[PDB]
């Protein structure tokens, strides 16, 4: 052991040297000059309420229209946002869904949780119902999170502490990531689909080439669990939220800590993230059963949506930033502008 | 507006089938199982009947329905998980109650369960499971228990003890001194939102469905009456 | 995937008869049905709807009351009962497929037709009559309303469908841009919301029949003459 281990603690403080030889300012400094964002009303302009129990997660068709929402009642529904009409409601075979996801063409939606399989959903049948087309089984704890690349292949998070991408026409494990130490709580693609970046229930946060099966960046500088994890829309930097109460912003480029976004009467957990499609605002969802609007360039408080009666659990922007939805333990989502 | 008045019209059949299993997912009560590796749990479901993440048993007695989720294969991390069932009825927690060394360990579980954010609203039901062991492993004198737990030779037996017709002085102080020690946690930092119903239990008893259906039926009474404002 | 009508034949002017479709291999419960005519030798005429559900039930003028339209979910089976009849009523009867939410093509599947043989509304308007066209060349089909199909919400209610001979008729676009599953995709449309065209970047033999267009913006839904593709 002893022999690798301070080659190890040598590499770390050199990676550590090579963070800090790069940190010839902070982004507090470089956007210290700039218009911050003028303070953001938004209003709730739907309620989506068809839900028995808690929401966990939600995600956008890539319409900008249609949403799919997943909740411990054992159902996805899926939401044509424009007129609140349920466009599917679909029964699940466990009720302990966690993560929930569309393929990008709408062909596909996908599920998991606390039974470890990924259930992915067919909705263009020839039969006109929805029904599950694979389940995928080899994860060994809970899905945290879902997402597809194309019809035919979803990277997936596990409590297992993998993450793992599939051929969904084979069921199987095309590539498997393991460098996590703790669960992995979420996932985001970046926008090109070649890289994704994942938190893990260990402070740290990984950057994966999909088309290699290896960790290229691991980042670190927050004191508890990750939840949630979002890519800037340039593809090259993302946000976090966590236990910790702050929401951190990386580079890939600059391999570190760009913006702490806290606030001193904010003491709880942050269960999601996103960004508007400019990138300018992070949305981040609480514990204290609010979101807060941040500027993503100067950290500071740009608004809150305060309409949710329990737990913020998840957020989503449309790709064409006309609305944030959010999803909540109340059994609600709402919709903002 | 033709299409989109039958989509309005197809929205509204789904909502009757929403509504329709809203009072199923009222009616049942659901039950998160817990306990160590040596707890029997995986026998007490059998008592409850008569890579996959979580196990959903089915049953009912007096025509109210129970489901009770064992999880099954995950990590000896639980902090995570465990945020899903802030929605249950009640915990129910499995212990071999058979002098283990280990013993101290469920107690450790069961302290971090008892004190979860998660679970500040949650009542936990008890089993103290193996007690025909216990028996067996006092009456052969073969028990250790003030040599890991030394406190036993100080504590003696409540008169809240109510044993069963010829169980000895040392099974019945045993099983109260194992039982107290869950409570001793339970009472410290319980508040009156949440409440522990502990059992005597073993391998072959039938009651087990009949303890879980009282102490819910307890539960929900305590519910009941906090929104009345009446406790 | 199949619907099969059953009933037809002869019929006494002053008598009754009554149809019955029978749908297998799909969630039948799940769709809205249309029945449809097609008089011998001419074009489609609409005569009935029911919602999912049975919710919703609509008629052509022609048909009102003197016809009636149910629903047997249990048994995934549709019937129109004729309850008087005329020379004016002599057509094959086809049971139509639909179903209604954002995206979904309604018509996309039609029986082989059962026939029966006796002893404002929007206008629809097709300019053509037959085009006499040969393989792998291009061709336009054109179609007009006497109200304009595009609903402020931005749909452009026109369906096309293509019928060959001998068969009943096939979806090919279901909104204007909107081609069909199963479709080759050569076949495409366009238009003002007043005036329409459907267009064929390159013939071939399996294209040869009748084009009818048809409106979806309020019933009664209203066909085109038809326009004929011949060698």
């Known amino acids: 052991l002893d022999q690798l281990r301070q080659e190890a603690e040598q590499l770390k403080n050199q990676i550590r040297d090579a963070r800090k030889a790069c940190a010839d300012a902070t982004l507090s400094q470089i956007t210290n000059n700039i218009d911050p964002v003028g303070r953001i009303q938004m209003r709730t302009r739907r309620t989506l309420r068809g839900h028995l129990a808690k929401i966990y997660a939600m995600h956008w068709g890539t319409d900008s229209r249609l949403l799919v929402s997943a909740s411990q009642d054992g159902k996805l529904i899926i939401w044509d946002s424009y007129t609140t009409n349920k466009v599917h409601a679909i029964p699940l075979r466990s009720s302990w869904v966690m993560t929930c996801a569309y393929a990008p063409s709408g062909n596909y939606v996908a599920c998991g949780g606390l039974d470890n399989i990924c259930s992915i959903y067919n909705l263009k049948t020839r039969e006109g119902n929805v029904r599950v087309s694979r389940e995928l089984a080899g994860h060994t704890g809970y899905l945290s999170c879902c997402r597809f690349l194309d019809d035919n292949q979803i990277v997936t998070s596990s409590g297992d502490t993998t993450c793992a991408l599939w051929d969904i026409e084979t069921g199987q494990q095309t590539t498997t990531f393991t460098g996590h130490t703790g669960d992995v709580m979420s996932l985001s693609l970046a926008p090109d689909t070649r890289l994704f970046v994942s938190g893990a229930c260990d402070a740290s946060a990984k950057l994966w080439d999909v088309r290699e099966g290896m960790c290229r960046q691991t980042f670190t500088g927050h004191e508890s669990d990750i939840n949630a994890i979002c890519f800037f829309p340039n593809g090259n930097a993302f946000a976090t939220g966590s236990d910790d109460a702050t929401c951190r912003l990386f580079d890939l480029r600059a391999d570190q800590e760009l913006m702490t976004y806290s606030h001193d009467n904010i003491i709880c957990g942050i269960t999601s993230v996103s960004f508007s499609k400019s990138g300018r605002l992070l949305l981040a969802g609480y514990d204290d059963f609010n979101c807060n609007v941040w500027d993503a360039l100067k950290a500071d408080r740009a608004g809150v949506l305060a309409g949710h009666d329990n737990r913020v659990s998840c957020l989503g922007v449309t790709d064409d930033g006309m609305a944030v939805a959010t999803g909540s333990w109340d059994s609600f989502l709402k919709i903002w502008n | 507006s033709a299409e989109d008045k039958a989509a309005v019209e197809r929205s509204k059949m789904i909502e009757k089938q929403l509504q329709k299993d809203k009072q199923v997912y009222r009616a049942t009560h659901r039950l998160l199982l817990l306990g160590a590796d040596n707890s029997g749990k995986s026998t007490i479901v059998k008592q409850m009947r008569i890579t996959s993440g979580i196990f959903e048993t089915k049953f009912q007695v007096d025509k109210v329905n129970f489901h009770m989720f064992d999880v099954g294969a995950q990590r000896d991390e639980r902090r995570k998980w465990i945020q899903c069932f802030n929605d249950v009825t009640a915990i129910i927690f499995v212990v071999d109650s058979s002098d283990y060394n280990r013993l101290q360990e469920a107690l450790n579980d069961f302290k971090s369960i008892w004190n979860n954010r998660w679970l500040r609203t949650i009542s936990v039901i008890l089993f103290l499971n193996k007690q025909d062991l216990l028996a067996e492993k006092v009456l052969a004198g073969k028990s250790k228990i003030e040599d890991y737990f030394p406190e036993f030779a100080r504590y003696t037996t409540p008169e809240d003890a109510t044993p069963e017709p010829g169980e000895d002085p040392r099974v019945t102080r045993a099983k109260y001194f194992i039982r107290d020690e869950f409570l001793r946690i339970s009472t410290a930092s319980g508040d009156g939102r949440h409440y522990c119903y502990p059992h005597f239990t073993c391998s072959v008893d039938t009651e087990n469905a009949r303890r879980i259906f009282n102490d819910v039926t307890d539960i929900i009474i305590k519910m009941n009456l906090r929104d009345c404002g009446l406790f | 995937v199949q619907l099969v009508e059953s009933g037809g034949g002869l019929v006494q002017p002053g008598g009754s008869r009554k149809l019955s479709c029978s749908a297998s291999?799909?969630?039948?419960?799940?769709?809205?049905m249309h029945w449809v005519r097609q008089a011998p030798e001419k074009g489609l005429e609409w005569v009935a709807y029911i919602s999912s559900g049975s919710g919703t039930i609509y008629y052509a003028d022609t048909v009102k009351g003197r016809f009636t339209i149910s629903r047997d979910d249990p048994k995934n089976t549709l019937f129109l009962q004729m309850t008087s009849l005329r020379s004016e009523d002599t057509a094959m009867y086809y049971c139509?497929?639909?179903?209604?939410?954002?995206?979904?093509?309604?018509?996309?599947?039609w029986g082989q037709g059962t026939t029966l043989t006796v002893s404002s509304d929007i206008v629809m308007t097709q300019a053509t009559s037959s085009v006499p066209v040969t393989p792998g060349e291009s061709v336009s089909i054109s179609c007009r309303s006497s109200?304009?199909?595009?609903?402020?919400?931005?749909?452009?209610?026109l369906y096309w469908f293509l019928q060959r001979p001998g068969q009943s008729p096939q979806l090919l676009i279901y909104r204007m841009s909107n081609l069909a599953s199963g479709v080759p995709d050569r076949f495409s449309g366009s238009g003002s919301g007043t005036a329409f065209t459907l267009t064929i970047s390159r013939l071939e033999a399996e294209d040869v029949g009748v084009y009818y267009c048809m409106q979806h913006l309020e019933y009664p839904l209203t066909f085109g003459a038809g326009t004929k593709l011949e060698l």
């Open positions: 109200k304009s199909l595009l609903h402020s919400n931005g749909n452009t209610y």
């Open positions: 139509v497929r639909s179903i209604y939410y954002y995206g979904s093509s309604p018509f996309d599947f």
């Open positions: 291999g799909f969630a039948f419960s799940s769709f809205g």
